[PDB]
């Protein structure tokens, strides 16, 4: 690993600098190096890992959607333009899959198995669901069903733990429910399940806000608003 010679603390420090500089590929590489040191990650470090790869894959997903839309238009009275659109869509797709495989590999070797506290285990299982979901967005072949089921299974295990071990306002639990609801709506073709999950999550969080400090209230209501935003689009 290219980061093998750098101190763990230096990798974390540089990840934070990379974030400030909006250098998300660098940030992700630094955080991958930090994970590969073999020690568990603190809450702050988990969030650096997630922010870094979310930004990287987000740029790839947006690019893939642009190219896929052009490719679909080319297959409608449309003039033949050769293999280039498909080729370039495939190039971006392969790079996106590579990033997802990298994240899933870090989770499997060995972040999840060492994560015993609910906050860390739920966080990593949610990430596993997310990156299988991004794989599912581009999957078209004989493994699409297994990719979808891998996302579902990771989200479901995260949900089971979060309901047992975390309050309904916990921001990790809320973000998991938000993402699993989008999985249901967009990936599993289950809009009713998506709506039910988002509504129940929102309502149970609402009922628990009274227990929170001002700062926790702000954290939780921010994510609740995202649930509401989706419900408004879906109903």
């Amino acid at each position: 690993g290219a980061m093998g010679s750098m101190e763990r603390a230096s990798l974390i420090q540089k990840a934070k600098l990379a974030e400030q500089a909006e250098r998300y590929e660098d940030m992700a590489a630094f955080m991958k190096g930090a994970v590969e040191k073999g020690e568990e990650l603190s809450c702050e470090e988990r969030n650096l890992l997630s922010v870094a790869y979310k930004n990287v894959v987000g740029g790839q997903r947006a690019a893939w959607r642009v190219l896929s839309s052009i490719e679909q238009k080319s297959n409608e009275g449309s003039e033949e333009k050769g293999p280039e659109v498909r080729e370039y869509r495939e190039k971006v797709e392969t790079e996106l899959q590579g990033v997802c495989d990298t994240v899933l590999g870090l989770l499997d070797s060995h972040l999840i198995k060492e994560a015993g506290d609910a906050e860390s285990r739920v966080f990593y299982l949610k990430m596993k669901g997310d990156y299988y979901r991004y794989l599912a967005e581009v999957a078209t072949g004989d493994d699409k069903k297994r990719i979808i089921d891998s996302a579902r299974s990771a989200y479901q295990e995260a949900m089971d733990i979060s309901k047992k071990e975390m309050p309904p306002t916990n921001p990790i639990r809320l973000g998991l429910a938000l993402n699993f609801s989008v999985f249901h709506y967009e990936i599993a073709n289950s809009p009713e399940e998506a709506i039910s999950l988002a509504k129940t999550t929102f309502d149970e969080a609402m009922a628990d806000l009274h227990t929170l400090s001002e700062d926790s209230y702000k954290d939780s209501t921010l994510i609740m608003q995202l649930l509401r935003d989706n419900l408004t689009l879906w109903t």
């Binding site: 998300y24 922010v51 959607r65 967009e186 995202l226 649930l227």
Partner: peptide, 12 residues
């Protein structure tokens, strides 16, 4: 594509 809200950086 219309993207629904998911957690964290709206980076796409």
């Amino acid at each position: 594509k219309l993207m629904f809200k998911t957690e964290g950086p709206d980076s796409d």
